[PDB]
Amino acid sequence: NFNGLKGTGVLTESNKKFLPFQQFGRDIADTTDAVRDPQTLEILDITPCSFGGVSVITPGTNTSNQVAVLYQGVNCTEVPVAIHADQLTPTWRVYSTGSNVFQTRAGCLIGAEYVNNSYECDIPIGAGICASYQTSQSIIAYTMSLGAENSVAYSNNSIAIPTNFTISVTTEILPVSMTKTSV
Amino acid sequence: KIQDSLSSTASALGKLQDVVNHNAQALNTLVKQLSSKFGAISSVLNDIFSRLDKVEAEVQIDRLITGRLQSLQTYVTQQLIRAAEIRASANLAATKMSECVLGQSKRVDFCGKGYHLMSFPQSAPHGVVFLHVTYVPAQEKNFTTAPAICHDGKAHFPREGVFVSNGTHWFVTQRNFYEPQIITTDNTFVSGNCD
Amino acid sequence: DCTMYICGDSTECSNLLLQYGSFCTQLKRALTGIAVEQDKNTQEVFAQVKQIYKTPPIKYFGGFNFSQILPDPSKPSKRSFIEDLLFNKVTLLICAQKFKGLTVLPPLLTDEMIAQYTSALLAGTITSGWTFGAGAALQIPFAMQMAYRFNGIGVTQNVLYENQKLIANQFNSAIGKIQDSLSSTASALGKLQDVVNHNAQALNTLVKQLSSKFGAISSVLNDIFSRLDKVEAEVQIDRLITGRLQSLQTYVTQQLIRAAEIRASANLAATKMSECVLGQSKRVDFCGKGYHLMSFPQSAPHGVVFLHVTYVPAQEKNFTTA
Ligand SMILES: *[C@@H]1O[C@H](CO)[C@@H](O[C@@H]2O[C@H](CO)[C@@H](O[C@@H]3O[C@H](CO)[C@@H](O)[C@H](O)[C@@H]3O)[C@H](O)[C@H]2NC(C)=O)[C@H](O)[C@H]1NC(C)=O
Ligand SMILES: *[C@@H]1O[C@H](CO)[C@@H](O[C@@H]2O[C@H](CO)[C@@H](O)[C@H](O)[C@H]2NC(C)=O)[C@H](O)[C@H]1NC(C)=O
Ligand SMILES: *[C@@H]1O[C@H](CO)[C@@H](O[C@@H]2O[C@H](CO)[C@@H](O)[C@H](O)[C@H]2NC(C)=O)[C@H](O)[C@H]1NC(C)=O
Ligand SMILES: *[C@@H]1O[C@H](CO)[C@@H](O)[C@H](O)[C@H]1NC(C)=O
Ligand SMILES: *[C@@H]1O[C@H](CO)[C@@H](O)[C@H](O)[C@H]1NC(C)=O
Ligand SMILES: *[C@@H]1O[C@H](CO)[C@@H](O)[C@H](O)[C@H]1NC(C)=O
Ligand SMILES: *[C@@H]1O[C@H](CO)[C@@H](O)[C@H](O)[C@H]1NC(C)=O
């Protein structure tokens, strides 16, 4: 209730340069983001805690009962800030400082071990990372493979000519119409 | 193998299954979306009229008409979006029939993967399925080639084909099938000297 | 995010949100469908090859000079000389004020992976002709390959060999003019410039829309409770939730229009690379301006750039015919 300001959010020490009679702090969205504390000249910026989107990696429920959790765009040492009870709605504390932690360009995911081979992509993650449920079964995270490497023996007096042929039949499915509805 | 490929895995027809799965999902949300209150006393429509008199009942009833009148408008708008991308796919299947089925296509990678020969249509619920037949080269060899040949001080060029040599003396073949032939005035045309 | 955008960090409003209920969940499934599609648009264009070829060390392709489009190993990023001019010509605290549940997800394919697909297309289309897009790749000298590109236009193959040195110079000269032309002006990259401008402007109006009263007593949620009686305060707060829910709806609807337009353009780049790049096109004014010979792809931020090579007749003379 700082001199008539009501809201919610942790208070952190800030070092912005105010002016002799500048009390409030206004952001682009016209919301408070800084307050001059009464009885002091201190300035505190009002922001929530370490927050973002929480995603769950999982195979089918029937296949297994295991999950992996990815926090989007957070430093991997700033996630264990809220390992407590009555502090978070999510109290699953074994996943914060838990299994093999691997840091990606989209935050660090916990519960999957990073192997350093490469296969095709099964469950996309982001920035060239994919996850799969391989074998003794556990979830792993690897880097995508673009395909099999190859090289052509180019020369200025060499040509290659086929001597046989194969015939293949391929399918292709296209939608053409949908259901008619009246209300 | 086409019959057994489809009958093995059921995920091949997912392009038609999600078209009918999306329409059913849109109606289910619309039915479940009239259980909201929109800030009124209750969702039941005639409970307002049986508990309040005419002078503040209109405040509540209007708060519910516009709420339900806005969930219909949202549903209609999404259908206009969906119908404009099914139509963009019905103009693609109407072209594959006119060009791949009713003729032979020279556009590459349009009616299959390889050199197109001929296609057959088949009908599926809310869609169409094409059976492209293509031509693919099998195992190959490699030879030594030469751009031209000088015989009487004049260059010679192949009318249709390439010059190859199996190690000792030269030949002329096709470009898509190794069928060696002897060099002849019939096979070649002359143009200028050979320097 | 549903809850944090409209009245984030206020538990006295979150329970009020359950009254409307499944309205915002429809928005999440709408925006998630857009994001998944963007990862498929990129896949259809650059992933038309089952092999990752690489060029041999020798760089004598019959006199043609390809050094301006092949990758440069010296640079930390394996991007060609031309591709560097494009990355420095597209301009993208701005994202720090997005605590309202607005996030920018990262693409599935990193920009160093797309340059590997593009380098495979180039290294397979100069050593094997068009034969790698219809089966096993078969090598062919570049000097002879250009003779079957003239032969498809309608000009015999005895004119390329007799003019091979002159044709090489014209190709090399025109390939160095593009480098200076791109670095001369800045309006050539306009098509990709407004794609990111529209998205940045759309989010800005969304953020500024939560500072509007919507005709109510006060914009901020906290003082409404402290300035009105509790019997009728619940009427005013839901009267403010409607605006913050309609505003989020118009943003989603506008994106659905834009996504279809980009989808119709990502389906054209896939055709332009199947036909012009992996073959020779007889369609007029499709892969350039004139008689088509070949094309080369390049990668740009959120797009692709083609380099069409064509054939144009020079000075002519009148004649009499029967
Ligand atoms: C490259 O192709 C040439 C042409 O086919 C090959 O030379 C050919 O070799 C056969 C096998 O000896 C010769 O056939 C012989 O013909 C005589 C004719 O009287 C006959 O008496 C023999 O019993 C035998 O059938 C054929 O004449 C000869 N071609 C020519 C033009 O002389 C050559 O072997 C091939 N090289 C490689 C490495 O495969
Ligand atoms: C070209 O390939 C075909 C198969 O793709 C070859 O045909 C096979 O030949 C063997 C030889 O004994 C037979 O056992 C197979 O039954 C044939 N396959 C079929 C489908 O009939 C053919 O021989 C090859 N041609 C050349 C010149 O190598
Ligand atoms: C292909 O063209 C490039 C220019 O785009 C040539 O690179 C130049 O080479 C000359 C002489 O070798 C140098 O003086 C220039 O400084 C080079 N310029 C750049 C930008 O590198 C290159 O040499 C040509 N290819 C071949 C095989 O000569
Ligand atoms: C259980 O899930 C698996 C995939 O995880 C699926 O193949 C199987 O059909 C499912 N069984 C059911 C739904 O009864
Ligand atoms: C996370 O914080 C640590 C501590 O400074 C830092 O070393 C690391 O680079 C950070 N991770 C990032 C920025 O992705
Ligand atoms: C691959 O295995 C682990 C994966 O984390 C890694 O530490 C190790 O150094 C790698 N070994 C080789 C040979 O690449
Ligand atoms: C092919 O290139 C090499 C390397 O420059 C050269 O030595 C050779 O003579 C060339 N072959 C022909 C037929 O020109």
Side-chain angles (χ1 to χ4, degrees), chain C residues 255-310:
Chain C
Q255 297 291 298
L256 267 297
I257 304 293
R258 265 174 204 131
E261 186 167 10
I262 297 282
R263 169 68 162 170
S265 168
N267 284 341
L268 181 58
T271 308
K272 282 258 191 66
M273 185 179 288
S274 289
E275 315 212 1
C276 315
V277 176
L278 312 182
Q280 190 179 20
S281 200
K282 307 283 164 185
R283 307 165 73 190
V284 54
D285 274 28
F286 186 60
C287 317
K289 180 66 70 177
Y291 303 132
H292 184 243
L293 285 192
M294 51 205 298
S295 297
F296 302 112
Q298 302 290 272
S299 70
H302 295 344
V304 60
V305 171
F306 292 104
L307 263 60
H308 302 310
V309 186
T310 58

Side-chain angles (χ1 to χ4, degrees), chain A residues 3-76:
Chain A
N3 295 357
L5 294 174
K6 314 222 201 303
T8 301
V10 308
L11 287 163
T12 301
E13 286 86 357
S14 60
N15 49 1
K16 296 154 162 200
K17 323 302 164 296
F18 276 4
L19 289 186
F21 170 88
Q22 294 217 346
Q23 310 309 287
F24 292 165
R26 206 61 69 84
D27 73 339
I28 285 167
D30 262 358
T31 71
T32 74
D33 62 345
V35 178
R36 190 168 264 246
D37 170 68
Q39 310 148 33
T40 302
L41 60 84
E42 185 56 39
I43 320 295
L44 305 169
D45 46 347
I46 297 196
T47 179
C49 66
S50 89
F51 80 114
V54 161
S55 306
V56 172
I57 308 300
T58 180
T61 295
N62 315 333
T63 308
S64 171
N65 217 7
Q66 217 171 335
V67 294
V69 176
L70 184 145
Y71 310 101
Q72 300 182 1
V74 67
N75 192 255
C76 199

Side-chain angles (χ1 to χ4, degrees), chain B residues 64-75:
Chain B
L64 207 62
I65 298 298
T66 73
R68 275 172 194 171
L69 203 55
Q70 201 154 331
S71 66
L72 271 176
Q73 180 58 44
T74 292
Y75 164 77

